[PDB]
Amino acid sequence: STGEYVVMTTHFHLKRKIGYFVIQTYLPCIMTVILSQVSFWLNRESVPARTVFGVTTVLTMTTLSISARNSLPKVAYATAMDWFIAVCYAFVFSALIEFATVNYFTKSQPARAAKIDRLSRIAFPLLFGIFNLVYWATYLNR
Amino acid sequence: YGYTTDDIEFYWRGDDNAVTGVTKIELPQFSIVDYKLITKKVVFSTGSYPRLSLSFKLKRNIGYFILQTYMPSILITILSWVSFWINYDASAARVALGITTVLT
Amino acid sequence: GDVTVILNNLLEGYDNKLRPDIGVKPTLIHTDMYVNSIGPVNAINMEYTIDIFFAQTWYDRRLKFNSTIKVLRLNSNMVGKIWIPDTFFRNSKKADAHWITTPNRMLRIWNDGRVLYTLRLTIDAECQLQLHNFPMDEHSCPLEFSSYGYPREEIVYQWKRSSVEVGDTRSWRLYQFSFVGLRNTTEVVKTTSGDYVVMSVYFDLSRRMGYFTIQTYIPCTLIVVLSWVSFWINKDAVPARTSLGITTVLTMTTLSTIARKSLPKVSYVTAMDLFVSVCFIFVFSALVEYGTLHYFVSSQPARAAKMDSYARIFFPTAFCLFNLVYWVSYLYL
Ligand SMILES: *[C@@H]1O[C@H](CO)[C@@H](O[C@@H]2O[C@H](CO)[C@@H](O[C@@H]3O[C@H](CO[C@H]4O[C@H](CO[C@H]5O[C@H](CO)[C@@H](O)[C@H](O)[C@@H]5O[C@H]5O[C@H](CO)[C@@H](O)[C@H](O)[C@@H]5O)[C@@H](O)[C@H](O[C@H]5O[C@H](CO)[C@@H](O)[C@H](O)[C@@H]5O)[C@@H]4O)[C@@H](O)[C@H](O[C@H]4O[C@H](CO)[C@@H](O)[C@H](O)[C@@H]4O[C@H]4O[C@H](CO)[C@@H](O)[C@H](O)[C@@H]4O[C@H]4O[C@H](CO)[C@@H](O)[C@H](O)[C@@H]4O)[C@@H]3O)[C@H](O)[C@H]2NC(C)=O)[C@H](O)[C@H]1NC(C)=O
Ligand SMILES: CCCCCCCCCCCCCCCCCCCC(=O)O[C@H](COC(=O)CCCCCCCCCCCCCC)COP(=O)(O)OCCN
Ligand SMILES: *[C@@H]1O[C@H](CO)[C@@H](O[C@@H]2O[C@H](CO)[C@@H](O)[C@H](O)[C@H]2NC(C)=O)[C@H](O)[C@H]1NC(C)=O
Prior knowledge:
The structure is cut from a larger assembly and holds chains A (about 140 residues), B (about 100 residues) and C (about 325 residues).
Chain A: H1 19-37, H2 47-70, H3 80-105, H4 110-140
Chain B: E1 30-43, E2 48-60, H1 63-81, H2 91-103
Antiparallel strand pairs in B: 1-2
Chain C: H1 3-10, E1 27-33, E2 37-42, E3 47-59, E4 71-74, E5 87-89, E6 92-97, E7 105-110, E8 114-126, E9 138-147, E10 155-164, E11 179-190, E12 195-206, H2 211-228, H3 238-262, H4 272-299, H5 301-332
Parallel strand pairs in C: 1-10
Antiparallel strand pairs in C: 1-3, 2-3, 3-8, 4-7, 5-9, 6-8, 7-8, 9-12, 11-12
Helix pairs in contact in C: 2-3, 2-4, 3-4, 4-5
Bound molecules: a molecule of 10 linked components (NAG-NAG-BMA-MAN-MAN-MAN-MAN-MAN-...), phosphatidylethanolamine and a molecule of 2 linked components (NAG-NAG).
Phosphatidylethanolamine binds near residues 86, 89, 93, 101 and 124 of chain A.
Main location (chain C): membrane
Subcellular location (chain C): Postsynaptic cell membrane; Cell membrane; Cell projection, Dendrite; Cytoplasmic vesicle membrane
InterPro entries (chain C): GABAA/Glycine_rcpt, GABBAg2_rcpt, GABRG-1/4, Neur_chan_lig-bd, Neur_chan_lig-bd_sf, Neur_channel, Neuro-gated_channel_TM_sf, Neuro_actylchol_rec
């Protein structure tokens, strides 16, 4: 509004180091997902063990999401780490839901329960591996 | 500071309208009950100095505390009481309940 | 050359303690702004940071020269030698000008005495946010300024047609909110000293949902469905269901504590703590429901057998209903 001014600009290009976020979010998330999928190799007679597995893994994922969101500014969109934590939460919740379904079919159709349990002993780890590959590939290429 | 009571004299102008804008003060946690205006003299080793005092009386609100830390205590104690309806044969459930409530 | 002579003749017999037209008429000051960035609106302190380019222009018949040059363009070396109005911002907690590398000021004295004085400011203005409808709340909170010692009879401010002009609105630090508009206003206030002309600029901020949507809402609804998962586990396994209930309650209270720790201590009930309270009630009701189920198994088994399947339908329906009601109501309010 006052005149035309000469402006000199200087951009310093940066690049964040992912080591600390790996160590403090991605390792605990992956370890929690593994600890959750461990609940499939336990026998169907031990109900309290699998219930503890499921509940404690869901709580761990919740507190991990909370501690992971504290580091960032209070931003109003979803980051990549947010998508990773959401997918890990979905995996642990699906493990708990599968255990609940198995227990619901136990003592009534134990063949179907054993079938879906032996299938979930292979379906979850491969799906998690595929998701990890896709996520890391599409986010490290940029 | 520098001038004793034989060099300066403090007084409120109006003695009740000297301080204004108190009723408009909104505090997120307290509430101004009232305020007093006092005029006196202090005595130090160097002389007697004039003094005024504007003394507010803040009263603390209770709603936030009820909703934040009294209700959870009562609900945790009730969650402890539920263990009385459970039969004495289940030793892993009543222990669970009680221990968890203690921790909480 | 000759500009030195002009500057010396303007400051010969000049008293910078007397406003122009000290005993004739009030001094009309035209004020403009340029909002660089509206900083973070932190609700805990009820304040918000803003960075502006405050421009004040008035007429001074004493800085009136007659030469070929039309305008004198000067830095901050001659600001402390002429009269400068004492404009202060009445709702600023802490504000300060810029001094690197040289005081950020500008002084342009035209031929007929018209003076333009521009400076750079960073004001931490104050506005008491009514934290109801949180986080679905909208605020419109001001930036007020006026003269300090000169009442309405001496200094009168007046906006220009194109006074306030925001910048790009994209590189601002408005994270949780969103700029929607502004408006200027002029009024007259009464003080123990006199009547003052108080100008105001109201900025309209709308809280965009997001951070809270993913920080508290989703976690709490996911805890609610976690508590519902217990309704399908067989009723004979007591420890599993008791652990479910009690750990779910613990996580619920932790999340409520965090959510309330987000915003400051307010003694009223917001719309977020209401949500976490309803979720808490849901979890507690699922646990006492299982408790009564286990107690009635010893008394009458068919009662509990029907109660389980009754709850399996009654809980998710009541939660869908609650959600619908809540959301619709607040979005219309
Ligand atoms: C309790 O005690 C407190 C501590 O003692 C006290 O605080 C002090 O208050 C005084 C007065 O209010 C302050 O002194 C004034 O400061 C003004 C600006 O202050 C800002 O900058 C200082 C740092 O000052 C350096 O930087 C400026 C800008 O570059 C220079 O102009 C200064 O000279 C000085 O430069 C030296 O130091 C630099 C390193 O920093 C060196 O690089 C440099 O080479 C120099 O060596 C900050 O500290 C201030 O921060 C504080 O204040 C802010 C206020 O909002 C607070 O928010 C914050 O928290 C801090 O508390 C602030 O950022 C100066 O402009 C001012 O000097 C001008 O005014 C006086 C009086 O009118 C003139 O006599 C003087 O000559 C200056 O005028 C000339 O320059 C102006 C430029 O605008 C011209 O317009 C003017 O016309 C005039 O030019 C003419 O003369 C020139 C020669 O003088 C000549 O060159 C020209 O050509 C022309 O002829 C004054 O110094 C002091 O800084 C405060 N100190 C602190 C620590 O806060 C407090 O008030 C006390 N409380 C009570 C109730 O009493
Ligand atoms: C590339 C991967 C990326 C995917 C992203 C997320 C994926 C989550 C993790 C994987 C989900 C399931 C893994 C594969 C399925 C298991 C294979 C055997 C299970 C099976 O037979 O299907 C039924 C479902 O069981 C179950 O497995 C029940 C659980 C499955 C879903 C439960 C829903 C959980 C919701 C998660 C989100 C919540 C929070 C998210 C923020 C079992 O019983 P059936 O009788 O139907 O079988 C019919 C045959 N007899
Ligand atoms: C800023 O203030 C100016 C001056 O008060 C406003 O300009 C007036 O706008 C109204 C309607 O737009 C017109 O009827 C008047 O004639 C204008 N006055 C002058 C002197 O131009 C302007 O609207 C204000 N900006 C806002 C409210 O955003």
